[PDB]
Amino acid sequence: ETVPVKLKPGMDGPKVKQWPLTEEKIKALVEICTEMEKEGKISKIGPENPYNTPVFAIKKKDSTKWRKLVDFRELNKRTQDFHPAGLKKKKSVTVLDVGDAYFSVPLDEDFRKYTAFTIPSINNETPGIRYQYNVLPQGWKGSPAIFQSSMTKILEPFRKQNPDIVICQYMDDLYVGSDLEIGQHRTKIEELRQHLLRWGELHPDKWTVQPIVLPEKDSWTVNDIQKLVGKLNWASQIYPGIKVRQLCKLLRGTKALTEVIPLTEEAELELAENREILKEPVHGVYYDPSKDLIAEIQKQGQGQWTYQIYQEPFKNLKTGKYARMRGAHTNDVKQLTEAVQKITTESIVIWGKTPKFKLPIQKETWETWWTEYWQATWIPEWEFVNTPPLVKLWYQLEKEPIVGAETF
Amino acid sequence: PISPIETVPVKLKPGMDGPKVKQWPLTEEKIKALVEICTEMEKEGKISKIGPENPYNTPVFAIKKKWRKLVDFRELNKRTQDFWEVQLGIPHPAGLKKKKSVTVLDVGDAYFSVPLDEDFRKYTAFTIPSIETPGIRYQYNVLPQGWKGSPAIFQSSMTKILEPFRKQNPDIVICQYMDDLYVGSDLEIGQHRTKIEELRQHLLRWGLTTPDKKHQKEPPFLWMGYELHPDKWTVQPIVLPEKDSWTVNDIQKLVGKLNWASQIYPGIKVRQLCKLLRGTKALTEVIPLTEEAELELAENREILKEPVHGVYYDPSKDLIAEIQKQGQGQWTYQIYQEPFKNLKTGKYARMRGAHTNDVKQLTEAVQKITTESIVIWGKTPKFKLPIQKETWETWWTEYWQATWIPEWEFVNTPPLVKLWYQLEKEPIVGAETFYVDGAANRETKLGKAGYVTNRGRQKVVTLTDTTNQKTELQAIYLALQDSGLEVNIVTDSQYALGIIQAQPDQSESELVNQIIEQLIKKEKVYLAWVPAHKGIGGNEQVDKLVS
Numbered sequence: 001e002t003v004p005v006k007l008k009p010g011m012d013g014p015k016v017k018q019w020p021l022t023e024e025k026i027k028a029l030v031e032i033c034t035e036m037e038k039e040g041k042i043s044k045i046g047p048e049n050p051y052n053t054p055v056f057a058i059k060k061k062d063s064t065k066w067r068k069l070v071d072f073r074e075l076n077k078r079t080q081d082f083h084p085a086g087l088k089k090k091k092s093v094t095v096l097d098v099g100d101a102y103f104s105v106p107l108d109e110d111f112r113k114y115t116a117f118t119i120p121s122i123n124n125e126t127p128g129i130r131y132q133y134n135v136l137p138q139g140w141k142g143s144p145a146i147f148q149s150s151m152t153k154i155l156e157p158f159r160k161q162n163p164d165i166v167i168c169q170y171m172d173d174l175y176v177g178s179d180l181e182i183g184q185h186r187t188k189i190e191e192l193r194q195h196l197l198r199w200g201e202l203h204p205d206k207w208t209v210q211p212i213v214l215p216e217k218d219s220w221t222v223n224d225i226q227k228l229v230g231k232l233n234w235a236s237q238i239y240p241g242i243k244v245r246q247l248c249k250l251l252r253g254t255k256a257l258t259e260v261i262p263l264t265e266e267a268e269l270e271l272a273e274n275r276e277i278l279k280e281p282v283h284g285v286y287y288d289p290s291k292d293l294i295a296e297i298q299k300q301g302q303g304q305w306t307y308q309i310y311q312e313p314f315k316n317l318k319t320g321k322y323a324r325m326r327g328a329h330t331n332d333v334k335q336l337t338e339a340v341q342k343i344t345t346e347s348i349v350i351w352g353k354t355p356k357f358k359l360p361i362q363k364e365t366w367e368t369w370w371t372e373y374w375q376a377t378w379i380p381e382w383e384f385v386n387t388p389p390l391v392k393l394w395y396q397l398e399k400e401p402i403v404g405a406e407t408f
Numbered sequence: 409p410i411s412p413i414e415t416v417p418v419k420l421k422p423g424m425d426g427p428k429v430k431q432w433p434l435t436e437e438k439i440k441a442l443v444e445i446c447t448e449m450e451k452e453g454k455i456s457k458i459g460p461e462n463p464y465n466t467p468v469f470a471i472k473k474k475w476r477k478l479v480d481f482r483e484l485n486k487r488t489q490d491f492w493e494v495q496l497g498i499p500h501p502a503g504l505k506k507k508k509s510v511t512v513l514d515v516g517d518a519y520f521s522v523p524l525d526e527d528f529r530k531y532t533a534f535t536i537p538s539i540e541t542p543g544i545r546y547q548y549n550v551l552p553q554g555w556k557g558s559p560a561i562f563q564s565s566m567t568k569i570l571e572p573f574r575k576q577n578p579d580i581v582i583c584q585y586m587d588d589l590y591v592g593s594d595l596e597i598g599q600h601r602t603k604i605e606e607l608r609q610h611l612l613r614w615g616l617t618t619p620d621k622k623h624q625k626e627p628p629f630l631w632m633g634y635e636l637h638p639d640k641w642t643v644q645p646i647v648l649p650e651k652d653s654w655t656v657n658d659i660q661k662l663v664g665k666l667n668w669a670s671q672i673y674p675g676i677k678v679r680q681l682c683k684l685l686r687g688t689k690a691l692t693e694v695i696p697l698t699e700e701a702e703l704e705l706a707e708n709r710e711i712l713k714e715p716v717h718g719v720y721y722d723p724s725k726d727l728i729a730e731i732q733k734q735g736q737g738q739w740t741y742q743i744y745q746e747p748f749k750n751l752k753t754g755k756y757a758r759m760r761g762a763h764t765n766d767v768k769q770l771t772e773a774v775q776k777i778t779t780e781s782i783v784i785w786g787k788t789p790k791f792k793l794p795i796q797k798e799t800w801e802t803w804w805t806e807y808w809q810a811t812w813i814p815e816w817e818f819v820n821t822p823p824l825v826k827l828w829y830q831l832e833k834e835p836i837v838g839a840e841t842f843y844v845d846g847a848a849n850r851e852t853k854l855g856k857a858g859y860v861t862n863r864g865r866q867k868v869v870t871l872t873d874t875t876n877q878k879t880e881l882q883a884i885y886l887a888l889q890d891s892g893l894e895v896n897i898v899t900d901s902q903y904a905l906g907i908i909q910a911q912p913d914q915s916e917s918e919l920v921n922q923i924i925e926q927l928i929k930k931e932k933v934y935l936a937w938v939p940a941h942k943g944i945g946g947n948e949q950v951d952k953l954v955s
């Protein structure tokens with residue numbers, strides 16, 4: 001028996017246009033889909049079905065076989081509705097993919113039509129191949145919810161054998177957190193893993209919300225004060241106690257930018273007080289479940305990026321930096337996508353929800369190549385923006401290790 | 409005649425009923441025709457006379473194309489469900505792969521070959537008037553011409569029927585486009601012909617009639633815009649209508665037709681022609697061609713004589729794309745495999761975006777090309793761009809917005825795209841420092857723009873009918889004007905903060921374009937921003953005098 005699933009009140013199905021796919025991905029999808037069709041997991045549909053969701057193919061971070069990824073964002077937004085805080089604590093979390101479990105469960109036949117998707121044809125010579133789901137799809141939020149009851153069971157034995165370990169499930173992924181040492185962790189994973197088959201490395205503590213640090217300086221030029229004052233003044237939006245009157249007083253005059261200016265004992269203190277203020281995150285910023293999580297990224301350059309998660313402007317919940325991984329030296333898009341996936345995952349672990357992204361890239365650029373480097377089973381919301389010069393200059397000012405993180 | 413296929417379930421839009429529009433009255437001569445025709449069809453089983461119990465009706469008409477019947481489904485259509493009509497993705501000749509031989513089958517009248525979902529047939533009811541007396545009532549049993557769902561349903565059905573054949577003969581390519589079936593292969597002629605006859609007998613098994621030898625279409629194929637020849641494709645020549653009187657409307661049509669030609673003909677120009685639309689009072693208004701326009705219209709006539717032919721695709725060869733800057737903000741590209749053998753060409757325009765640069769723009773041309781390539785060929789081309797890899801690396805690396813260019817090489821084909829200027833990272837040590845500032849009364853529009861330098865030099869200019877944004881930008885312009893090859897400039901203007909980040913070389917505002925000119929003339933320029941309304945000296949003394 002299948003559980004009846006309905007769209008939210010007054011909603012109609014998604015009718016999202018399929019983006020162009022490259023030939024390698026189209027062949028792959030055909031192969032993946034003919035196979036699925038035999039198994040009766042998906043069924044060819046006609047033109048009387050107006051709905052449509054975009055599909056694509058990726059090769060997960062560990063694969064030489066293509067996987068099929070469907071963009072159910074729209075459907076999800078339109079699908080009816082249905083977090084162990086310790087997960088963000090644990091000194092070790094491993095993500096597991098249980099997405100295949102769903103294909104074992106049938107989808108309410110009345111709802112199957114909304115899952116329609118199209119495999120496009122090169123140069124449009126051929127009509128697209130239209131399919132639709134018979135079993136719980138991956139990426140769809142209704143899946144983990146319906147398979148919830150079953151997941152609880154298959155998992156129960158393990159939970160009870162280790163009330164220590166915290167298991168949390170988000171979308172297609174299963175998050176396991178423990179404090180055992182590495183080997184000790186990994187071993188208990190394989191136990192769990194094997195229990196799953198039987199039926200058919202993250203470290204949350206390093207995510208310290210680093211502070212902003214002003215430049216200390218032996219000598220100061222007019223240009224330096226100005227730069228400094230410009231950023232401070234802007235920061236006072238976050239920390240109202242920041243003052244600059246003493247510094248702006250040392251600038252009284254039409255001097256050469258390169259001219260050095262000796263600071264007064266007052267400009268000294270005013271500057272010292274500001275460093276003090278900046279030693280800790282603004283007070284009283286708590287997370288509100290009923291609000292959306294925003295994540296905005298700034299391209300700092302030379303391979304560096306900065307981000308901030310917040311719900312209310314200036315009241316960040318978490319800030320950070322991120323440097324490209326070897327190999328992405330000549331690709332901003334590759335880098336950026338890697339950053340999104342990382343930030344999104346952190347959000348899941350912490351708040352258990354994906355943030356909405358404000359990306360510093362042109363829409364056309366993003367839509368054209370992001371899937372080429374995407375590797376997660378989920379896809380967050382995102383909008384494209386223009387980075388204010390100052391928001392970028394401020395976070396460039398964030399603290400970093402005196403050395404880093406040491407290995408022999 | 410009527411094919412033994414499973415019907416597609418069709419429904420009316422969510423909250424609606426079938427149409428019931430009155431039958432437009434016909435002469436005795438016309439009803440006589442409509443009766444003949446319908447009696448024919450009823451026998452073939454395409455339409456069935458129906459009881460009066462049917463409340464819906466659609467007006468039928470008789471037009472002498474001898475005689476021909478026409479049904480007006482506008483109403484039924486607008487109230488019929490929607491279908492998955494994403495087939496509005498027209499292939500491009502450059503995307504077709506070469507074929508030893510191609511045969512085209514006609515499946516037109518074969519639309520009355522597909523049965524209509526018998527539960528929907530009832531809405532298709534129409535009436536044949538009388539000299540007022542009874543009146544003959546019919547309904548469709550098959551897909552009616554002009555009905556919203558006929559195309560969708562037929563195409564889908566054709567696809568089911570060709571499923572078997574395509575499976576057995578995977579070495580046979582079949583494109584379906586309306587009443588046409590383009591069947592091509594690389595089999596020797598006798599074998600190709602043997603297979604077409606095989607397909608034909610197959611189709612016939614499914615009731616689909618066979619196109620008489622009389623109606624056999626033959627190459628070159630005239631496919632909406634082009635002439636597909638066995639080894640190359642060409643573009644149907646575009647004729648410019650010559651006249652001795654030009655009205656606004658004629659001219660716009662000209663300009664529009666000439667604009668689409670720009671793609672396959674980079675030489676075409678339309679300034680003097682477009683310039684003739686200035687101040688126009690009516691579409692019918694006649695306009696005398698200036699001498700420059702006359703000249704222009706003539707040249708275009710010439711260039712349009714040259715035959716523009718492309719070639720087909722070979723999956724065993726690389727895809728290459730070369731781009732040229734033909735002027736500011738306008739590029740041309742040609743995509744090919746073998747040199748000279750163009751698969752296709754094109755050109756891009758743009759209208760003084762608030763503010764960008766040639767590299768940014770080159771960047772956008774590249775992705776535009778890339779997308780259509782993925783659409784047409786399933787892959788992105790190798791790029792041949794007129795830009796130094798040093799220029800690119802220098803730009804991208806520091807630009808505030810994520811950006812990228814797929815695999816490419818440098819092609820030294822002038823003019824090369826370059827950065828016109830680059831702001832200094834630090835203040836120019838021996839240079840004069842200009843503290844600029846402008847202020848205006850947004851109500852009166854009386855402003856002041858000016859500067860004071862560390863060298864004792866000053867200037868205040870008063871402007872009428874000005875804005876705040878302009879006094880600020882003007883103040884920056886005055887500094888650039890009065891300074892030497894090296895200047896340090898501090899302003900509190902937020903917009904200037906944008907110039908620093910974006911460092912544009914094209915702008916919508918001609919004042920901003922005048923500033924760009926000044927920026928390009930200098931050797932070194934350091935632009936610094938600071939908070940307005942603050943104690944900040946310099947930006948307090950010049951700032952106070954121009955307030």
Ligand SMILES: CC(C)c1c(Cc2ccccc2)n(COCc2ccccc2)c(=O)[nH]c1=O
Nearest residue numbers: 504505509510583590591592627631636637638
């Ligand atoms: C869709 C198929 C059948 C196809 C065609 C036909 C075709 C004709 C009109 C519109 C679309 C397609 N051609 C066009 O070539 C024209 C030609 C080729 C050989 C002999 C005469 C004419 C081609 O080069 N390759 C192909 O694969």
